[PDB]
Amino acid sequence: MAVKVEYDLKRLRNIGIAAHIDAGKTTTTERILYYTGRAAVTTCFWKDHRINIIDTPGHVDFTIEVERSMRVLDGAIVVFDSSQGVEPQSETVWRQAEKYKVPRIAFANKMDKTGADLWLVIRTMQERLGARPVVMQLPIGREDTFSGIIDVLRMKAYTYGNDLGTDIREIPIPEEYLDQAREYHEKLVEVAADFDENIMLKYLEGEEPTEEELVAAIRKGTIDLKITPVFLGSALKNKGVQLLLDAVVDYLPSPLDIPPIKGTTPEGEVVEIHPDPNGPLAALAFKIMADPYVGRLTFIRVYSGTLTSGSYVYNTTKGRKERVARLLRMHANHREEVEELKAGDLGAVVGLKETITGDTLVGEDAPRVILEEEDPTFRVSTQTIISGMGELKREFKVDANVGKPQVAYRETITKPVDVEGKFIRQTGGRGQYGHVKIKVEPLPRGSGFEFVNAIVGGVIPKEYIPAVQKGIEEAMQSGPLIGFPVVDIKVTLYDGSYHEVDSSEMAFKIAGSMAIKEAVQKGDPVILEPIMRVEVTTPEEYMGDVIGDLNARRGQILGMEPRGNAQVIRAFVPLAEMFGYATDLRSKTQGRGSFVMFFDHYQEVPKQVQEKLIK
Numbered sequence: 001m002a003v004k005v006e007y008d009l010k011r012l013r014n015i016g017i018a019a020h021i022d023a024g025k026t027t028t029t030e031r032i033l034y035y036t037g038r039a040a041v042t043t044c045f046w047k048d049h050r051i052n053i054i055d056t057p058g059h060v061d062f063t064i065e066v067e068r069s070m071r072v073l074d075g076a077i078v079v080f081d082s083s084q085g086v087e088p089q090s091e092t093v094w095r096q097a098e099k100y101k102v103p104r105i106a107f108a109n110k111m112d113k114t115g116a117d118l119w120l121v122i123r124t125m126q127e128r129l130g131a132r133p134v135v136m137q138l139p140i141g142r143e144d145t146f147s148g149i150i151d152v153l154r155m156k157a158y159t160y161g162n163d164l165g166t167d168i169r170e171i172p173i174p175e176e177y178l179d180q181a182r183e184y185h186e187k188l189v190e191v192a193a194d195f196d197e198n199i200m201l202k203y204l205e206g207e208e209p210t211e212e213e214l215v216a217a218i219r220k221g222t223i224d225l226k227i228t229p230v231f232l233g234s235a236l237k238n239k240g241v242q243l244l245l246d247a248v249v250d251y252l253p254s255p256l257d258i259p260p261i262k263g264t265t266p267e268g269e270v271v272e273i274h275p276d277p278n279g280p281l282a283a284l285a286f287k288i289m290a291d292p293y294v295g296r297l298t299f300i301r302v303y304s305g306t307l308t309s310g311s312y313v314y315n316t317t318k319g320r321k322e323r324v325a326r327l328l329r330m331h332a333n334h335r336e337e338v339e340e341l342k343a344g345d346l347g348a349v350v351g352l353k354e355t356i357t358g359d360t361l362v363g364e365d366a367p368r369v370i371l372e373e374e375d376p377t378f379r380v381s382t383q384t385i386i387s388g389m390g391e392l393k394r395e396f397k398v399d400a401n402v403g404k405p406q407v408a409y410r411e412t413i414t415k416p417v418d419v420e421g422k423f424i425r426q427t428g429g430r431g432q433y434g435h436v437k438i439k440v441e442p443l444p445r446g447s448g449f450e451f452v453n454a455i456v457g458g459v460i461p462k463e464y465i466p467a468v469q470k471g472i473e474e475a476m477q478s479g480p481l482i483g484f485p486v487v488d489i490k491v492t493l494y495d496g497s498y499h500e501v502d503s504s505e506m507a508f509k510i511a512g513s514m515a516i517k518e519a520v521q522k523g524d525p526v527i528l529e530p531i532m533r534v535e536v537t538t539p540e541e542y543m544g545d546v547i548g549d550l551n552a553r554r555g556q557i558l559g560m561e562p563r564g565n566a567q568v569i570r571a572f573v574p575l576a577e578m579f580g581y582a583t584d585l586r587s588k589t590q591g592r593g594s595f596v597m598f599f600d601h602y603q604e605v606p607k608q609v610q611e612k613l614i615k
Ligand SMILES: Nc1nc2c(ncn2[C@@H]2O[C@H](COP(=O)(O)OP(=O)(O)O)[C@@H](O)[C@H]2O)c(=O)[nH]1
Pocket: 019, 020, 021, 022, 023, 024, 025, 026, 027, 028, 109, 110, 111, 112, 113, 233, 234, 235, 236, 237
């Protein structure tokens, strides 16, 4: 750190660590930080490479977070529990890692655990993920006796003298392993051969290739998404972490290896953005932490150019200008202030005030391109009611704390009526008198609201119109079917009457309200429900029970498609049916299934559903 720090785009390693709950994602992160060393983004150094560890969403399912996290990072280290082989979230992260094309390597953690087995991992990877693993190391001892590791690419072994990580020594491959080892070396050379003509010829000739040669070939296959080097160890016992770190520099990609980010031009034509430090700056904000003692920290990833300390940058997705006060780099133990952050690098910036997650930041006379609160797409309303995306983009609303998820219904009429509101009273408040006659009528779906005043000859005193409208306005917030907002109607005030001294503003507000409660009740009202658009990812083995579930959930299948080794089914299913789904889709596809849905349209609840809802 600091002393003799080097840059180079080629020496950068922006990685993420993906894993199923309990696989050991954090414990390996802790160890990695502990080893390199002697926040949305922590940085460290290993063999002259800056490794930036981007923190990944713990809830492997929150697409917005997962989607974005895959864009800021360049390589992933998928961690497996060596006694479970591929697991649910692992498969999910896997498909995720593909829909975004992020090179990866795997780490079979927990080799010390009772039940641990490298082959269980390799096989399940091969079958569920449909991944081509490459065995790069072989264990020595097993379970309670695991205690060394064999580098089959280099044919070297390492033994660990304690569970503390303070005793490591290179040793000769034990005789009892020399052949399994010789076997895997060849399998590996064989694979490398698929990526370098030169290695095949030598393989064929019985010549042993150079480790530089092999490494490169595997690195190439890996960056190409062809193979998936597999490593193993025990984060908890301090066996294998350094070897894992060497692999990150050897095979994960640099910002130069992966392909250009693309963002849309100010007019609309998407252009690709190469990581050139000397070209227009363009950065993307991916996380906004509020430091308990430095304040709003904005974490960014720089795609092009150089962001310099104390400069003016332009947030293009907000049109605002911002001032970059300081630039920071989080480390294991400690922060470091920097003067600049060049392309392909990441850090935190102090000084932004209107920049929220997902915002693009181009500089001075840099072209305005768009690359895409902490946020979660929420919205507060009112007794609180925190509407949200799931469980326009906010059709499921919970209220306060206890209040269970409710589906945002709406109501309307189908037949135009011509009603009449009337208020007559002898309240303490003198004599109240209001009387309006209106014509309500249906408007095309989504047309909103339209109020027309058609009163002639001051039949209703001009000072009261605003009040009949405030009345109408209020009544509409709670239709008489199930009590949800009334929409898509056009009301025309066309007659009524008043009393010279009895009329009043409230008398006319009430009568506005009433005329409307009737209008809706008498215009053959309907309930409109949100129709979500879902995308269920199912291993084609289960692709029959699933579709069936959809159709039972008043769904309507659109199309199929393949996500490599799985099938993705698009459909429109009432959000009211999609309740609990996740819990019953796991069951339907043995946890190996996952969907994501987006509000699509509003449409009328079928008479039947209506009668149910109504009661
Ligand atoms: N035996 C053993 N347990 C491990 C190992 N790595 C992680 N664990 C245990 O797995 C549990 C959860 O892992 P953890 O890193 O803490 O969080 P995570 O990503 O959700 O897994 C903890 O009890 C760890 O102590 C390992 O190498 N060996």
